Amino acid sequence: MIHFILLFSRQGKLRLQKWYITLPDKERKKITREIVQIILSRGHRTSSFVDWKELKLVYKRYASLYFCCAIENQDNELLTLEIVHRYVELLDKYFGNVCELDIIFNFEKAYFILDEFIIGGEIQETSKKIAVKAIEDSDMLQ
């Protein structure tokens, strides 16, 4: 189960955040800053995996803004990368040529996609087109 997901920019600004653990706001704010500092202080050949406080923090940035996750030390690590790639593909397909501008302005759509795709740190839909159809049906309802 993914403890949290944080879409952060290369400049350090966070564009998305979804934590599955009930933590205090000051603690959450400190954790986010520490994750940004650790990820922002890492090279391009660090394996995209960090064990921060017994949690395999995996980072795989496909653009200037990066992505991060926090999986428990009981599952595979490449599965997190595959889930991140699937989520990126779903986000690109739902909007169409997803870029940085559409993420800050359309964060509400990203949150809804994340909710309809991953719930509770676990996955909700293994496919990539059924989720798109469900999101389109939910949005077209008005």
Binding site: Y62, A63, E89, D92, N97, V98, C99
Partner: peptide, 10 residues
């Protein structure tokens, strides 16, 4: 800029 670039370029 660096933000208008696509995420995966598909």
């Amino acid at each position: 800029k660096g933000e208008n670039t696509s995420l995966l370029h598909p």
